[PDB]
Point group: none
Chain length 90, copies 5
């Protein structure tokens, strides 16, 4: 008799982020990966190269210059607000 | 008789982040990975290279220059607020 | 008769971060990894290289220059607030 | 007759971070890893290299220069506040 | 008849961090790892290298220069506050 009651009665004015889950090489099975996922300026360079990517003779030069003027200005991230003044000014 | 009551009655104006879970090479099974995941400027360089990536003879130069003028300005991260003044100013 | 009551009645205006879980090479099974995960400037260089990545003869130079002018300015991280003035100023 | 009552009645305006869990090479099973996890400037260089990563003959130079002008300014981390003035100024 | 009542009635405006858990190579099982985990500038260099990582002949130079101008300024870490003025100024 599984019973999940979430947020039954809401008279007011809220700001909500609900997530209700009810259950009864690289291999992934039977999962929930990302629901509210925020990835900002994420980088992956060499992921899951194949079987024997450099088998016998390899002269590999891996230079990774992460070098830049960047400006991430997020006034409210994954954050609800009922009554508020959210501002980014310059 | 599993019964989960979350946030039954809310008269006011809240700011909520609910997450209700009810249950009855690299291999991952039967999981919930990231629900409210915030990844800022995350980096992965060599992940899960294949079987025998440099087997016999390898001359590998791995230079990883993480070098940049960066500005992450987050006024409210994963943080709700009911009545408030959230500001980023310059 | 499992019964979980969380936050039954809320008249006021709160700021909440709820998480209710009710249960009845690298291998991970049957888990909940990250729910409110905040990863800022996280780095992983060599993770889970394959079977025999440098088997017989390897001349590996691993230079990892973590060197940059960076500015992470987070006014409120994973921290809700009901009535407040949250500000980042310059 | 397992019964968990958390935060039954809240008239006021709080700022809460609830987490209610109710239960009845590198291998990890049957766990909850990170719920409110905050990782700032975390680094992992060589994790879980494969079976026999440098088996017979290896000339490995591992130089790890962690050297940079960095500024992490977090005004409130994993810390809710009901009525308050939280400020980062310059 | 397990019964856990936490924070039954709260009239005022608090700032709370609740965590209620109710239960009835490197291998880890059946655990709760980190709930409110704050890791700042944590580093792990060589963790869980595979079976026989340098078996027969190895000339390994491990130089780890942890050398940088860094500024971590956290005004309130894992510390809620009801009525307060929390400030980082420069």
């Amino acid at each position: 008799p599984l019973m999940v009651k979430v947020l039954d009665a809401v008279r007011g004015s809220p700001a909500i982020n609900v997530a209700v889950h009810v259950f009864r090489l690289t291999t992934e099975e039977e999962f929930v990966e990302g629901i509210y996922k925020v990835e900002i300026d994420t980088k992956s360079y060499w992921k899951a190269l194949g079987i024997s990517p450099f088998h016998e003779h390899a002269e590999v030069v891996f230079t990774a210059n992460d070098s830049g003027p960047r400006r991430y200005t997020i006034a409210a991230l994954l954050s609800p607000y009922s009554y508020s003044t959210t501002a980014v000014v310059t």
